[PDB]
Homo-oligomer: A and B are copies of this chain.
Amino acid sequence: VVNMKAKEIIEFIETFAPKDLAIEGDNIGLQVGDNLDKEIKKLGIALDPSLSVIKKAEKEGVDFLFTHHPLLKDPIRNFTGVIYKKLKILMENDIILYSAHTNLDICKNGLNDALAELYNLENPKPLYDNGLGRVGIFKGSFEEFLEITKKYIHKNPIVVKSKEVDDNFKLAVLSGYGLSQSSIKYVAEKADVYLSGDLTHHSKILAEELGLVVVDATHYSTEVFGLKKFKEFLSSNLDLEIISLDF
């Protein structure tokens, strides 16, 4: 166990998930920070750079805060309320905030590959062109798929049973939010079952009409699974204390 500098953590992460992989206009990289020669005693991993995560980072003496989601998607020019409180804590404690978003989704053994491997997808391919998600054939019954889901991801997934599903069906997976109306239409042409998160009403109705079976294992869980794999990957390779904050 040893102290690392900020650059060295960043180059290691960017080796695993190159910034080249992020879809256009994704706010990846350094979120908050100035000096990358800052010395790091404690790396914190989180899904969200939420207020309570940042408070907890300060309480636990985190020096480098890694989050999957960027601090801001839409840019701002006034600093009040919640964003004031978050930046104040990060700045007063001089805590570095860094994010790997879609580049962590897409890269090999990333969040989507983690799901694809979990379901042991036969000859998996990118679901989208950019290329988010994985699609392939699940060599098993629908109910062995659900049991794997319940065991490793979320024990109470929402199932939109739009049609009967035969063994050896085509399965698409997308970590996080993949259940938009436009996504449903697209995936309906490519798979029998769609595993993702953040189901809403209109998407549910749409999936039923198209006969696409949708499984909502929550936005949180479908990502945290991969994040745990990512956290174990860092711990094995870096001589550095690493904790998780919101999982």
Binding site for B on A (CB under 8 A): 27, 29-34, 48, 50-52, 69-82, 84-85, 87-88, 91-92, 176-177, 197-198, 200-202, 205, 208-210, 218-220
Contacts and interface: CB of A to CB of B under 8 A. Distances in A.
Contacts of A201: 176-177, 197-198, 218-220
A227 to B, nearest CB: 14
A219 B27 CA distance: 30
A111 to B, nearest CB: 14
A64 B114 CA distance: 47
Chain A interface, >50% SS class: mixed
Given A27-B77, A76-B76, A78-B27, A48 B205 contact: yes
Given A30-B80, A75-B76, A177 B198 contact: no
A155 to B, nearest CB: 15
A78 to B, nearest CB: 6
A69 to B, nearest CB: 8
A82 B27 CA distance: 19
A82 B84 CA distance: 17
Nearest to A203: B198
Contact of A33 (B80, B208, B209): B80
Contact of A79 (B31, B92, B200, B205): B31
A216 to B, nearest CB: 10
Contacts of A73: 77
Contact of A82 (B69, B82, B209, B220): B209
A73 B78 CA distance: 10
A182 to B, nearest CB: 9
A170 to B, nearest CB: 18
Contacts of A51: 208-209
Contacts of A87: 79, 87, 91
24 contacts: A27-B77, A30-B80, A32-B78, A32-B80, A32-B84, A33-B84, A34-B81, A34-B85, A50-B205, A50-B209, A51-B208, A52-B208, A69-B202, A71-B77, A72-B77, A74-B75, A74-B77, A75-B76, A76-B76, A84-B91, A87-B87, A87-B91, A91-B92, A201-B219
